[PDB]
Each structure stands twice: as C-alpha cells, then as structure tokens.
Amino acid sequence: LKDLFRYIWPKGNNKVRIRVLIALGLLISAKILNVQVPFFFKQTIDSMNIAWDDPTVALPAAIGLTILCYGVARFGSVLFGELRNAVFAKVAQNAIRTVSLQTFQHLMKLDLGWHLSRQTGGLTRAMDRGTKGISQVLTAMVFHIIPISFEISVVCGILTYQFGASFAAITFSTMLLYSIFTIKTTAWRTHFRRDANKADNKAASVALDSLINFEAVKYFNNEKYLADKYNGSLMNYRDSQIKVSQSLAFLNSGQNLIFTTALTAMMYMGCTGVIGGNLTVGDLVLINQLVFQLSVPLNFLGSVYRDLKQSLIDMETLFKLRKNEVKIKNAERPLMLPENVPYDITFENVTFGYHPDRKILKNASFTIPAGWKTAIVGSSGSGKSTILKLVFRFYDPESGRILINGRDIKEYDIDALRKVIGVVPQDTPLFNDTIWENVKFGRIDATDEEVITVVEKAQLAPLIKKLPQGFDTIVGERGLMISGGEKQRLAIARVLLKNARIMFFDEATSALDTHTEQALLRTIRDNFTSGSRTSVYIAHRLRTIADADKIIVLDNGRVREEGKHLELLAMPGSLYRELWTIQED
Amino acid sequence: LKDLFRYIWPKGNNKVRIRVLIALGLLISAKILNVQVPFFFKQTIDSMNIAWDDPTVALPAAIGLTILCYGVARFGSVLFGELRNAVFAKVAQNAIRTVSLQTFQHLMKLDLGWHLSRQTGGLTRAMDRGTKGISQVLTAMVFHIIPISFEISVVCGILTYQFGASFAAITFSTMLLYSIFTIKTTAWRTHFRRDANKADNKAASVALDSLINFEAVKYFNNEKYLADKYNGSLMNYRDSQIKVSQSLAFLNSGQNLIFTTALTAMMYMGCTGVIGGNLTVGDLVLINQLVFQLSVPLNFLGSVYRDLKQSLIDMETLFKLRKNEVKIKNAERPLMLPENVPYDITFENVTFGYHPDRKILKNASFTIPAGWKTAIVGSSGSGKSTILKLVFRFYDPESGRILINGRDIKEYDIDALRKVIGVVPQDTPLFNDTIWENVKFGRIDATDEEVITVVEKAQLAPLIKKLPQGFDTIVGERGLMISGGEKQRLAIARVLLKNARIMFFDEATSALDTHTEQALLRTIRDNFTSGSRTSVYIAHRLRTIADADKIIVLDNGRVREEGKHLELLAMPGSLYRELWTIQED
Numbered sequence A, B: 001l002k003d004l005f006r007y008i009w010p011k012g013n014n015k016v017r018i019r020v021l022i023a024l025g026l027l028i029s030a031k032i033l034n035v036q037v038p039f040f041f042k043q044t045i046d047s048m049n050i051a052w053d054d055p056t057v058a059l060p061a062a063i064g065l066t067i068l069c070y071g072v073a074r075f076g077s078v079l080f081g082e083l084r085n086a087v088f089a090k091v092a093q094n095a096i097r098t099v100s101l102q103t104f105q106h107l108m109k110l111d112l113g114w115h116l117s118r119q120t121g122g123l124t125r126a127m128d129r130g131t132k133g134i135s136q137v138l139t140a141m142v143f144h145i146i147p148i149s150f151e152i153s154v155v156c157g158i159l160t161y162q163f164g165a166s167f168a169a170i171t172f173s174t175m176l177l178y179s180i181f182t183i184k185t186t187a188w189r190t191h192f193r194r195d196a197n198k199a200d201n202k203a204a205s206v207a208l209d210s211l212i213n214f215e216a217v218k219y220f221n222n223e224k225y226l227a228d229k230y231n232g233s234l235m236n237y238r239d240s241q242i243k244v245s246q247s248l249a250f251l252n253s254g255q256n257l258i259f260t261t262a263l264t265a266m267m268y269m270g271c272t273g274v275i276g277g278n279l280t281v282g283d284l285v286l287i288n289q290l291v292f293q294l295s296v297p298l299n300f301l302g303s304v305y306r307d308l309k310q311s312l313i314d315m316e317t318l319f320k321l322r323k324n325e326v327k328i329k330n331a332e333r334p335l336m337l338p339e340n341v342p343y344d345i346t347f348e349n350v351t352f353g354y355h356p357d358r359k360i361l362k363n364a365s366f367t368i369p370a371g372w373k374t375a376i377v378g379s380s381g382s383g384k385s386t387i388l389k390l391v392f393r394f395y396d397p398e399s400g401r402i403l404i405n406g407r408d409i410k411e412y413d414i415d416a417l418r419k420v421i422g423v424v425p426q427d428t429p430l431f432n433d434t435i436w437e438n439v440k441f442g443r444i445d446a447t448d449e450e451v452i453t454v455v456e457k458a459q460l461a462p463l464i465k466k467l468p469q470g471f472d473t474i475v476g477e478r479g480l481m482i483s484g485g486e487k488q489r490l491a492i493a494r495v496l497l498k499n500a501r502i503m504f505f506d507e508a509t510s511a512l513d514t515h516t517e518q519a520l521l522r523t524i525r526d527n528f529t530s531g532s533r534t535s536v537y538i539a540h541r542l543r544t545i546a547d548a549d550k551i552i553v554l555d556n557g558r559v560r561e562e563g564k565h566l567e568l569l570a571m572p573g574s575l576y577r578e579l580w581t582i583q584e585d
C-alpha cells in the first residue's frame, strides 16, 4: 500500500497527477450530490404535506422544480461517480502495465541461482495474481473504502450540525462499537484466510509438479498417489474457505445489527423530537433516508469484497519480486572488450560453491589459450558446467580471478562479455514455436540466407527435406515434439548462427550417432580460420577430442594435468590414460 | 451454465439438494422482509403525521411497536440474506473441490500427444482461472442476479396491485427500455472484452515462454527483444481494458439515467395522485423508498461485477478441459497378464505417424525375444523412442499389431501393461523435491533398505557421501540443480527400484564417463538372473552393446537387419559395419 501509492502518485509526470486530482474532485462532487438529494426529498415531502382542497387542480411548478431537482441530483451523483471510475480506471490500467513491465525486466535481471531455486509456474501465478490484486485494490479503493468513508464523514457532520448533539452521541457511539467489533472479529478471522492461502498454494504446486512430469508419472503408474496428494490439500482448502465464508457472514450480521440498532434509535429519537414540536416529518424521512443510503453500501462493501487482504498480500508479494536483490552486476567504470583479439581465459586460484556448505572447485587454476581447440574431460560430477557458468559470469567465485587478456571479468560490461561467448548447454530447452524462430533466435537481425546456410551447415537439411512443413513445424512444449538429436543439432545451429568468438560446446554430441557427429565435427572444424575462435569442448566421448590441441583433466576441482593427447597417453599412470584404455577396451 | 447446474443440483446426493432448497427459502424470506420494511416506514410516517398538542407527553407504544418492527424487519432481511450466502458458500466450495478433482484425473487420463501439443503453465492458469470463475459465478448468482430479479418481480407486483395500472405502465415501459438499452450496448461492448482476453493470454504465454528458457535467453542476450515482445501485448491489453471500462461507465450511466427518469416520473405521478386526495404522503415515501432500494443494488450490480462474461468464459473452458476425448483406453473385456512369463514383444506390419502427414515407421516388423538383452541402433531421427512409446501404448498405430505372447496389447488392461514395463527416457525431468523422494518415486510402498541398496547399486553412493545433506538436497526446478550424470543415474535408480520385467533403457548413458558407464553396466548385468528380464537397450555408443544378444538396425522405419555382433561385423557392407568402423576410426 506504499509502492502502489508511489505508482499512482509518482515523482514527476504531472499529467497522471492531474488525472488523479480530477478523479478526486469528481468523487467529492458525487458525494456532495448524494448527500444533497434527501434534502430535496425532505422539501418535496414537507411541501406536499399541506391540506389540498381541490382534486382537479394541477400540481404547482414550485413542487415540480423540487421533483426535477431530486431527479437531477440523483442522476448527477451517479454520473459523477461513474466519470470518476472511468478516469481512475485509465490511471489504474497504466499503473498495471508499468508495474508488469518493470517487474518482468527485473525478473530477467536476476542471477541463475535464484531462478533455479524457484518454480516458473509459481512465478507466473504470482505475477498474474499480483496484477489482479493491484486491479482489485485500486477498484475497491476508488469505489468502496474512500467514498463511503467520505460519506460517513459528511453524514456525521450533517447530523451534528442539523439536529443537536444527541444524534452526535448516537453516531459516535455506533462508530465506536462498529470499530471495536470489526477489529476484534477481523483479528479472529485472519487465521482461516492464512490457512486457505497456504492450502491453495500447496494445491497449485502439486498440480504443476504433476503436470510438468507427465511422462514420469505415466511411466511409474503414480496417477492415484498424486491424485490423493492433490486431494488432501484440496480438502484443507475447502475446509478453510468454508470457515472463512461463515465467519464473514457472522461479521456482516453483527456489523449490520449494530448499524440497524443505530438507525432505529435515531428514528426513535427523531420521533420523540417530533412529539415536542421542534421537528417535523421531513426530519424523520431525512434522517432515515440518510442513514439508509449509508447502510446499504456498507452491506455491499462488507459482502462483495470478501478478498481484499488477500489482494494486499498478492500485491505485496509482487512488489517483493520487484524489490529483490540482484547480485551479479558490472562495476562502477566498466571496461569494454577489444576489437580483434582472440580471448584466452585464465583461472587463477578460483574457488566456488553453489551453496556455502560444499566447495566444487577446490583451488583450481588453469588457462584456456587463444586460438586453440581445447577439451575438458573428467568424471561425471567434477564441475565442468561449473567452469562454464563461471566464464559466462552467471555466478561469481569466492576467491581467485577469471581473467581475460590480463583484465578481470568483474570490470567488463556483462552484456559485452556475454555477446562474445557462444555456448551450447547439456540440457537444451526450446521455445514453443517453429524451427525457423528457434534457429533465428541466435541473431535476430540475421538475413535468411545465413539461416538457410547455417541449417544446412548444422546437418539438419534432410530433416527439413523430410518434414511436410519444413521451417514451420511447431516443436511443442520445451522441444519435446522432436528427439534429442534434432534438439542438439538445433542448439549447435543457434551457436553457429550467433557466430561468437569463444564457443563453449558443453556436450555438443550426446544423442547423435557416429556418422552425424563425425560429419558435424568436420563441418565445424572446416568453418573458421586458424587461431580465430577459442573453441572449448567439454566432452566425454574421447574419440571426438582426440585431435584437440590441449586437454584438461578435472576431478572435483583441482585440475590434475593438461597437455596434448599423445603426451597424455605416454604418461606413467594418468587418469586420461585409464579413461582412454577403458574407451578402447 | 449447464454443467455448473449439474454440479450444484446433481443426480442423487439429496443432502446438497436440501441445502440448495434451504438457501432458496432463506433468499425468498429475505426478499419478503426487504419488501415488508418500507410498509412499516409508511405506517410510522402516516401515524406520526397527526397534530400533536403536547410537548411533554411520551410517544405512544403503538408507534414504538412499529418502529421496532422497522428495525426487526431490516435486521431480519440482512440476517436471512447472510445465512443464505453462508449455506450456498458451503455448497459452492464443495462443488469447486469436486470439479477440481474431477478435472485433474481426466487431465491425467489423456494421451501424450495432447499434453505435448499444449503448455503446462497454460493448463495451470486455465484451471486456476476456471476455479475462480466458478466461485465468482456462484457468488454473483446467489447474491446479485437472482435476488435482484426476484426483488424486481415482487416490487413490480406491489406497484401493480397497490396503485392502479398507470404505475404498471411506467414500470413495464422502463423495464422494456432498460432491456433494449442493455442488450444493444452489451452487443457493442463484448468486442473489447474479447480483445482484452486475447491480449492477456498472449502476454501470459510470452512471459512463461521467456521464464522457462531463462538460460537460453541469457546465453544469447535476448532480454530486450523479449521485453519488447512482452510490451507490445501489454500495450494492447491496456488499450482494450481502458475501452472496456469506459464503455461500462457509459453502460451504467445510461441504465441509471433510465431508472432515475422512471423513479422521478413515479414520484411525480404519486404527487399528482396526492393532489386528487386518493393517496397520502405515506404513498409518496413508500414509492420512493421501494424504487430507491431497488435502484441502489442495480447500480452496485452493474459496477462491481464488471467481469462476469469472462468468468463464464473461464468456466466453460475449464469444462472444455473436462469434456475432452481420451483416445487411448482398454477394451470392453480387458485381459490380464500371466504370472511368471518373460514377455517377448512382436511388431508385425506396424505403421505409425504422430501426424497424418508423415509416417515414421514405414512398415516395420521385428521381434524382441524373451530373456535376451537386445539392442537397437540407428541414425539420429530413425524412430527408436517411437517404438518405445508404441510398446508403452502412449499412442497407437494405424496398422499392424504390437503382440505380447501372441495376444495384442489393445486387449490388455493399460495399468497391468504399464506396471510390467520399466523405462528410462532420453530427457529426464525430476520433481522439485529431495533425492530421497525422487528415488522413492519408483515404488511408493518400498522399504528404505531397498532404497539404500538401489542408490548404492546405481553408482550414486559417493555423491551422497560428498553432499552435506545427502538424501535431503532439493534438486530445484526440473532437476536443474544437479548435472546430467546424476540425473541419468537417478532415473536408472528409479527403474532399478521399480524392478519391472521389460526395462527399456532409452539412452541410459549419454552424459556419463567411461568408467561410470562400465561399472553401471556391470552392476546392472550382475543384478538379474538369466532369461528373466527382457532388457532392451536403445543405444548409440556401440561399445556398450557389443556383448548384446540381438542387435536391430533402424533407418526411418523398415528394420534393415537383426542379429549378433560378430555376424553383423562379418557382413558385406552393412550399416552396422560402417558405424562400427567409424566408431573404431
């Protein structure tokens, strides 16, 4: 309820502040007319109360002008209220777009660890419920809480000024009792809403976790156990929502009992004032009409807005998504990369763990030199994608430096660092789009001749010549509508279309046959000139990197050896010699 | 608006029908009291209108009983309305649970092609918006549309009976004008709501597609292009929502102008009836009070329920998810599998394409015999996971048979078929849970000694002995918090814990080193007895299946050859000989 006010009453941009003030003026004029209309009703009743002695005479125009003033006052109240709702809905819709676009870019700016420590369907559900919560809070605050509070203020002022201080005592007493009762029963009521919110979040989490892994559910026949794990949280949500609605019905019944006792005591005191002759029947109909037209929107406010604290909770968690902490960022004076330099990465005394408990790269130190196709081998789980994500600066180590041409990568701009490093990862997800949009995702501003020659360069041409909708077939959710071989060839096509300088191939071939991997490695080695690209092959198939220029052996950090292939085979008892021997036998 | 009525007024289960009838009776009694209360106001006004000649006398109890009847009638109306809302909220919450649980199981019952041709975040968003739409439609239909229609009916009846037929003419004319104006401006208004719904769905789709592939966005620096593709649909949604709210403000202003003209003409005709002496001032305050307490909830109905056709659209698309067509199902008299038989699969004249355009298995015919570790090789894209999904009966072919022990698999129960077939797939997703819950997902009713010996059997023991929270480390979203090697060893641990009979290994080793794959294949070959499990290895690493019992060569369907390894190497120019030669060179 603070950053929303910062968005609807910002610093600068005086046009939206003028629109907010126009909405406030229309609100004030609408409530003034809605208080003026029972005075016209009192006038047309207390004027008609005289004794008429002629059934054939028309009514005088002095009463017709008061009846027309009643009608014009009622319609003017409704018209001004709806114009206020129109202009503040324009302001609210602009605030909703700017908060959605300002939270999406900051959701994109965060590091990889925060995204892997969350759930993307949960993020999308939180963003959607926060947007609908912002809409519901602004709609409730421009229609229900603010106008009825202003109406209570002006009706209490009218009843203080017009009919002495006993009505002031009655109105102050019933506002005091109303506030005490509402505060006590809301402090009782919030626990069931907390339980309902927790049960609904657990239900959505189990439904999403069972719908993403549909193949891993139907492989092991766990439909019934997942349905029961869903059903338990559904029963908890049903019990908590039933108790929420029953306690809110008790809230509304007690509140409107207090207000009905107030209205009946006000009409009774007005009647015994009429007995004394100080008042008239116009005061009776004025007092009832004022308190009744105050009592009806209080009932509808308490009824139809049963979820407003939940909307504040959703708005607050959307702003908490907005107000998180990005921890990977460029320095104060960021340097820029040179123009024609093959880059040689150098790790000195690096040490990094994804959590502070374990340390993956226990004092690793090596160098990837420029222009040489180097190759990283190692046992499964020895941190090779770790040093990939450390060059790419997704994370940052605890000690050591990640130097490029002597300068650190902490002092480089992160976009100018990530624009020269092309990479295929181990597990490749795709977009729910065609093959053409997925290949063209490398360079957006790329001509289609380059896209065609890259697709025919990445050994994907017979697949497009065999498909009936080539460069148009939708690959479905996450690339699951094609196999693993076409997915890895598509990722290699993306990196070949980007045409970067470093080219980290992180398991470039895992699900391709021997002929396709040999033709693909031949047409990648035949692509670029000597000493231009600093190609880094993270590979387990040791035959594919037998012709490499420098091989680096990893075993849970602490690089054991590095050198050419013949020297590593002619070494007395290395790890690469044993891996090559079990490969050849 | 039909299946919702089928859920709130079902066949059988008479307790919820008694609860619905109790809600309807409380609604009728609440509206009867709300029509009775201005008659008590007319009584206490027309009784107080006499000439009082004493300021010191107390008011008579004959007026105090009418004032107490006014207060009791108002509070009884509010109390009966809130009790009705309570019991129908109980019915609505039970209907919401049973529709969520009845749509989740049918979302699980569908085939794989429907799930791959959709988006899981879209399914979760549709389920959540359909649930909130069911809640909003039932809350609106028990509080706004039905009670105000019943109130309009009884107030029109009162004004027909009590004050002649001229008020009947006025009320019928203003209902006719109200209906004509509402129908015409709603037929104008629905287009902007359609555009807003399309823009919101496209915005949510682009946000989810960019948040799932966060690594593939940050690899290629496409933050700004995705932000602009988000921003365009956000601007379309903002324009359409602004036009929706402005047209709804025009709707409410015109409707309440018609009703204000009706109320002013009714008060004018009542006044000129009072001039004739037939009526009194009690009729004036009765007519205004009745039409005013009808006019206020019509205004709040038109205002606060600005999204009800959207709630019907979300409810009908949730029911459309419920009323889809499952096309993979067991027969009328499903057989069951025998008790101790090693199963031998036999494909005869099979032909299957995922779409009717292309045909993957162009007349394939082979046999996987029982007790033999067979091995499928082939070029990348030749349909190996296709015949995996055809044995598992995710899909069904166009011709040919998929026989097991002579009998077809169309006449077997699908759960008794899927309970003997264990399988690891190519791309393995995991649950957002620990390693213990992910290994235990194979057999839920498995003792923990079996889980420990399977984890130490699937070569995962040094990872658990190196982790600081072994069997407790959360693997994050979709298993991305561990590497590919631990993911494939986890899937092999799942299949080893299920202890099935067939064991389709679909690229069991793609991201493991040579030592780990050799130890894993040795401890899998040392597990089961001879001639018990009909192990089927879909493999590209031809060294891992050199000791297989029967190798089958695929190339875009139409199985080329099948036989042992030595006979396939000693063949004049086969495909497997060329793959083995490029493997050895």
Ligand SMILES: Nc1ncnc2c1ncn2[C@@H]1O[C@H](COP(=O)(O)OP(=O)(O)NP(=O)(O)O)[C@@H](O)[C@H]1O
Binding pocket: A113, A116, A354, A355, A360, A379, A380, A381, A382, A383, A384, A385, A386, A387, A426, B480, B481, B482, B483, B484, B485, B486, B511, B512
């Ligand atoms: N976000 C993460 N949080 C915790 N551990 C992680 C995370 N990412 C990777 N790891 C762990 O860190 C260890 C090695 O990291 P990793 O760099 O992924 O090895 P790897 O080279 O990819 N293994 P492989 O794919 O078989 O070659 C393993 O225990 C991983 O599970």
Ligand SMILES: Nc1ncnc2c1ncn2[C@@H]1O[C@H](COP(=O)(O)OP(=O)(O)NP(=O)(O)O)[C@@H](O)[C@H]1O
Binding pocket: A480, A481, A482, A483, A484, A485, A486, A511, A512, B113, B116, B354, B355, B360, B379, B380, B381, B382, B383, B384, B385, B386, B387, B426
């Ligand atoms: N739902 C699908 N819709 C359309 N095509 C599909 C679908 N699933 C798989 N395919 C295509 O069908 C062809 C081969 O299917 P597939 O069985 O996945 O081959 P594969 O053996 O897995 N290839 P590989 O992983 O390299 O061994 C390929 O063109 C796939 O893209």
Ligand SMILES: [Mg+2]
Binding pocket: A381, A384, A385, A426, B483, B484
């Ligand atoms: Mg790795």
Ligand SMILES: [Mg+2]
Binding pocket: A483, A484, B381, B384, B385, B426
């Ligand atoms: Mg395959």
